[PDB]
Amino acid sequence: GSSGSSGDAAVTPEERHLSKMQQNGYENPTYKFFEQMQNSGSSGSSGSSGSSGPTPKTELVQKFRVQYLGMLPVDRPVGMDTLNSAIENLMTSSSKEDWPSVNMNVADATVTVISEKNEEEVLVECRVRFLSFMGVGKDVHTFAFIMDTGNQRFECHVFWCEPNAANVSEAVQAAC
C-alpha cells in the first residue's frame, strides 16, 4: 500500500543510463532514414547481396566477454515489449550456465560475435546499418539486438553481459 516519503537517492551511475534504455530503448535512425538510396536491378540470379571478401583494417576496437543465448524470431523490428520477448524466450530454453562464452567486438562501429574458444572464429557478423532496434530487458544483464537479414525478416539475438549490459550497450550506442 501507499508507503514512502522517506527521501533517499541510492542508485548506481551505471543504472542511471541502463534505466532510459529499459524505458524506451534505442532505435536506429538510419534503419528508417534508409529511404534516400540508389539501388540497381540488373541480371544476376543469385541468393546473396554480392560478395564481401576479406575483413577491412582497424586501429581501435573493444572486446567484451559475454555469453550467447541464441537467435529468436520477432514480429517487429522495434518495440521494447518485443525485445523482452526474445530474452524470456531463450532464457527459458537455455539456462544461465548453458549459455556458451563468446567475445564481442565493437570495431569500426561493427558487431562481430567472436568465439571464446577461437578468436579467428566469427560466430555472427552484424553491422550497425542492419541493426534496427536494441535495448535492455527487465534485467541489466540481458541485452539483445534485432537485425535485418532481408525479405522482411528480423533476427533477435540475446547476449548476457557482466557485471552488466551497461558497457557493451553503451559502446554500441556510438556504433550507430
Domains contained in the chain, number: 1
Q: How far apart are CA 17 and CA 82, in angstroms?
A: 20
Among 89, 77, 102, CA closest to 160? 102
Residue 152 belongs to a domain: yes
Solving technique for this entry?
NMR
Q: Is 106 helix (H, G, I), strand (E, B) or coil?
A: coil
Residue 4 belongs to a domain: no
Q: How far apart are CA 160 and CA 97, in angstroms?
A: 10
Q: How far is CA 71 from CA 8, 139, 142, 157, in A?
A: 40, 18, 14, 4
Identify the sign of the CA torsion 104, 105, 111, 116: negative
| CATH number of the domain to which 167 belongs | 2.30.29.30
Domain that holds residue 77: 11-176
Residue 1 belongs to a domain: no
Which grid coordinates belong to 149? 537479414
Burial of 47 (0-12, 13-18, 19+ CB in 10 A): exposed
Residue 6 belongs to a domain: no
Residue 5 belongs to a domain: no
Number of Cα atoms under 13 Å in the Cβ half of residue 89: 17
Burial of 66 (0-12, 13-18, 19+ CB in 10 A): buried
Residue 111 belongs to a domain: yes
Residue 139 belongs to a domain: yes
